[PDB]
C-alpha cells in the first residue's frame, strides 16, 4: 500500500493518490405514507399473551404469502359427515393453511384423509377412461370376469 514515487528534488514531483472525497450529505424530506392499522380477529382462537406484548405485522402485495404462512391458521372443527348413509354422523377435520390457494377445495380436500381417497378414486377413474373405449377387447374379458367369479373376488381384496 505504497505509491511508487521518486526522490524529492528542485524539480517537481507529481504523484497520484486518490482523495477521501466530500459528500455533504444531501437533504431528503421523505413524506408520510398513509398507514392504516387493520384490527380484528384473524385466527381461530384467543391468544394467551396480553395485548401490549404482541406485535403488528406489515403486509404488502409481495409478502402476503409469507404473512399467511407464518400465522399458522389452523382451523380444527367438527363438521357433518355426508360421505355415508348416516345423517347423524359427524367428522372432525384438520386444516393447515400456508397460501391463498389453501382455501380452494383442491387443497382443503387434500388435507382431509377421508377425501384423499376419493380424489385418488377419481384419478383412478380418469386414468381408466382413456384406454377404455380405444381397445374393444376390454368388454370381452368383462364377460370372462362374469364367468370367472371365484378368481375375480380373490383379486379385489389385493
Amino acid at each position: 500500500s505504497k505509491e511508487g514515487s521518486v526522490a524529492p528534488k528542485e524539480r517537481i514531483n507529481i504523484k497520484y493518490i486518490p482523495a477521501t472525497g466530500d459528500a455533504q450529505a444531501e437533504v431528503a424530506e421523505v413524506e408520510l405514507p398513509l398507514k392504516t392499522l387493520v384490527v380484528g380477529d384473524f385466527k381461530g382462537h384467543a391468544e394467551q399473551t396480553p395485548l401490549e406484548e404482541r406485535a403488528t405485522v406489515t403486509v404488502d402485495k409481495n409478502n402476503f404469502e409469507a404473512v399467511m404462512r407464518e400465522s399458522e391458521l389452523k382451523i380444527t372443527a367438527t363438521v357433518k359427515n355426508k360421505l355415508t348413509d348416516d345423517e347423524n354422523a359427524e367428522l372432525p377435520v384438520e386444516l393447515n393453511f400456508k397460501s391463498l390457494a389453501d382455501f380452494a377445495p383442491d387443497a382443503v380436500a387434500s388435507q382431509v384423509p377421508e377425501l384423499k381417497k376419493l380424489i385418488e378414486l377419481r384419478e383412478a377413474l380418469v386414468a381408466l377412461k382413456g384406454p377404455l373405449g380405444n381397445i374393444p377387447a376390454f368388454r370381452e374379458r368383462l364377460q370372462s370376469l362374469l364367468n370367472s367369479e371365484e378368481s375375480r373376488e380373490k383379486l379385489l381384496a389385493e
Partner: protein, 473 residues
C-alpha cells in the same frame, strides 16, 4: 395373475415402466362398483365411468359444502380473504403501508378495562406510541375495525374508548354495525323498514344517542351493510384443478363469503391517497367513493335469470339519506352490475343545534363541518405532518417570527385560495385558506400557542330542479 395380463395386453403401459401402479388401481376400483349394474360394453362403460363420477361428486361436493361454510371457517375466511381485497386494490408503490393486528373483539374491551386510563392501554401502544407518537415512525391514518357492533353496553363502552383513542392519535376508527344493530336479526329485510328515524329514538339506544352527542365521537365512522368476497365455484366458470366443484349455495344467504365493509371503505381512503396524496375524495360514484369490481353470482330465480346482489340489501336513496342523517356510511349498490358507491361519509357525531344568534347560526355551520369526515382526513394529515415536521426542529435556533414563517410558507403549498381552480388543483391542494396566529406562554418563556385555522373546499350534495313550462321562452 389375470390383472397382470390385462396390463401386459394394454400396450400403452405394458412392460412395467411408468404409471402401472396407478392404472392397476383404476381397474380394481371399477370392478368393485360394477356389480350394481352388470354391463359389458366399453362406450357404455365410458358413460358408466362418468355415471360413477357424477354420483361421486354428489358424495364429495356435499362434504365440501360442509367442510366449508362453517362458522369457524367462514368467519375466519371473510376476515382474511377480505384483507386480500384490501391488499390487492391499494397501490403499495404509491406510499402506502398497512399494519395487521391480531386481537379479538372480546379481548379488546378487556384491554381497555385493563388500564385505568385510555392513555395507558395496550391498543394505545399500537395506535399512538408505536406509530404516531414516535420519532421517525410512520403515523396511523385510520383503524379498520373488522367487527360486528351491537348496541349493547359491551359495544358502546368500546366505542367510547375508541373515540377517545381516535381523538388522541388523530385517526378515525372505521368499523361496521351488524344486522342486530338495527333490530332485524336477518339482514335482507332492511328496505322493509318504513321509519328508521323512530327506531333510533328507542330506549335501547341510550348508550348510542349519548355516544353521538359526545365530542370525541368525531373520530368514529361505522360503515355499510356487508359485501361479497368469493364467487361460488363452478366447473365451467371458475374451475378447480383436476376436479369439478359445483358449490351448492342454498336459500340461506349466510353461506356466501360475506366480508366486512370496513375493508371496502378503507379501500377508498387509500385509493384516494394513491392518486392525490390526500383523502377528502371518498364520497363520489364518479369521484372516488365507487367500490368497483364486486363479485357477482348469476343464478336462476323463479323463472328469470337474475344476479345475487353483492351488498345484501338494495339501499334506496331515501334510506341512504336517512342513514346519512343518523351517522352511517352506507353503500348503495349499482343495481344490475358489479359496482357500488358511497355518497356521504358522515361520522356518528350529531350537529349540535346552537341558538339563533349571529355567532350561533355561524358556529352551527362551523360545527357541522367537523362531523362529516372527509374534512377530518384533511386535518388529521395536518396533525400528522405537523407533528413530524416540528419534531425535527427541537433544539434549533428559532424565533416566534421564525415559527410563524416556517408554518405559513409550509401550508401555503396546500392552499389554493381560488374560487374555481381546475380539478387537480382542488385535490392536490385540499385547503382553501389557512390562518396561523402564533402567541406566547408567559411565566415559562418559549412555548407557543399557535392556532392553525384551515378551511376546505365544498363538494356537491343535493339540489331541487323545480320544473315547469313557460310556453314562449
Amino acid at each position: 395373475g389375470s390383472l397382470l395380463d390385462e396390463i401386459m395386453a394394454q400396450t400403452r403401459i405394458a412392460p412395467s415402466e411408468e404409471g402401472y401402479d396407478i392404472a392397476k388401481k383404476g381397474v380394481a376400483a371399477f370392478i368393485e362398483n360394477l356389480m350394481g349394474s352388470q354391463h359389458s360394453a366399453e362406450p357404455v362403460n365410458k358413460s358408466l365411468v362418468d355415471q360413477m363420477l357424477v354420483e361421486l361428486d354428489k358424495k364429495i361436493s356435499a362434504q365440501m359444502d360442509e367442510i366449508l361454510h362453517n362458522s369457524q371457517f367462514q368467519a375466519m375466511e371473510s376476515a382474511w380473504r377480505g384483507l386480500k381485497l384490501f391488499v390487492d386494490r391499494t397501490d403499495f408503490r404509491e406510499n402506502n403501508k398497512v399494519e395487521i393486528l391480531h386481537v379479538t373483539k372480546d379481548e379488546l374491551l378487556e384491554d381497555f378495562e385493563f388500564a385505568p386510563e385510555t392513555a395507558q392501554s395496550g391498543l394505545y401502544k399500537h395506535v399512538y406510541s408505536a406509530g404516531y407518537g414516535q420519532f421517525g415512525g410512520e403515523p396511523v391514518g385510520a383503524i379498520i375495525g373488522n367487527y360486528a357492533f351491537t348496541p349493547s353496553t359491551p359495544d358502546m363502552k368500546l366505542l367510547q374508548y375508541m373515540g377517545a383513542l381516535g381523538a388522541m392519535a388523530h385517526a378515525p376508527f372505521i368499523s361496521s354495525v351488524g344486522p342486530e344493530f338495527f333490530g332485524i336479526d336477518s339482514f335482507e329485510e332492511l328496505p322493509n323498514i318504513k321509519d328508521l328515524k323512530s327506531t333510533f329514538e328507542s330506549p335501547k339506544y341510550t348508550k348510542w344517542r349519548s355516544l353521538r352527542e359526545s365530542e370525541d365521537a368525531r373520530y368514529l365512522g361505522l360503515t355499510a351493510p356487508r359485501f361479497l368476497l368469493r364467487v361460488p365455484y363452478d366447473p365451467i366458470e371458475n374451475p378447480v384443478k383436476s376436479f369439478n366443484y359445483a358449490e351448492n349455495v342454498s336459500a340461506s344467504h349466510e353461506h356466501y363469503l360475506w366480508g366486512n365493509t370496513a375493508f371496502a371503505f378503507a379501500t377508498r381512503l387509500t385509493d384516494s391517497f394513491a392518486k392525490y396524496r390526500w383523502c377528502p375524495n371518498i364520497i363520489g360514484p364518479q369521484s372516488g367513493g365507487a367500490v368497483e369490481d364486486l363479485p357477482v353470482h348469476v343464478f336462476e330465480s323463479m323463472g328469470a335469470l337474475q344476479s345475487k346482489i353483492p351488498t345484501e340489501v338494495l339501499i334506496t336513496d331515501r334510506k341512504e339519506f336517512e342513514l346519512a342523517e343518523e351517522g352511517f356510511i352506507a353503500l348503495t349498490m349499482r343495481k344490475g352490475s358489479d359496482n357500488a358507491a358511497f355518497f356521504s361519509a358522515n361520522s356518528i357525531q350529531k350537529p349540535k343545534v346552537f341558538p339563533n344568534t349571529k355567532e350561533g347560526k355561524e358556529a352551527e355551520t362551523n360545527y357541522k363541518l367537523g362531523t362529516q369526515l372527509p374534512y377530518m382526513m384533511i386535518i388529521n394529515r395536518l396533525a400528522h405532518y405537523v407533528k413530524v415536521l416540528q419534531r425535527e426542529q427541537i433544539g434549533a435556533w428559532k424565533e416566534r417570527q421564525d415559527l410563524e414563517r416556517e408554518l405559513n410558507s409550509w401550508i401555503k403549498q396546500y392552499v389554493a385560495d381560488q374560487e374555481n381552480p381546475p380539478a387537480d388543483v382542488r385535490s392536490r391542494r385540499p385547503l382553501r385558506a389557512a390562518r396561523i396566529e402564533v402567541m406566547d406562554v408567559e411565566g415559562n418563556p418559549g412555548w407557543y400557542q399557535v392556532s392553525l385555522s384551515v378551511r376546505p373546499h365544498f363538494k356537491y350534495m343535493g339540489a331541487n330542479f323545480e320544473l315547469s313550462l313557460v310556453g314562449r321562452l
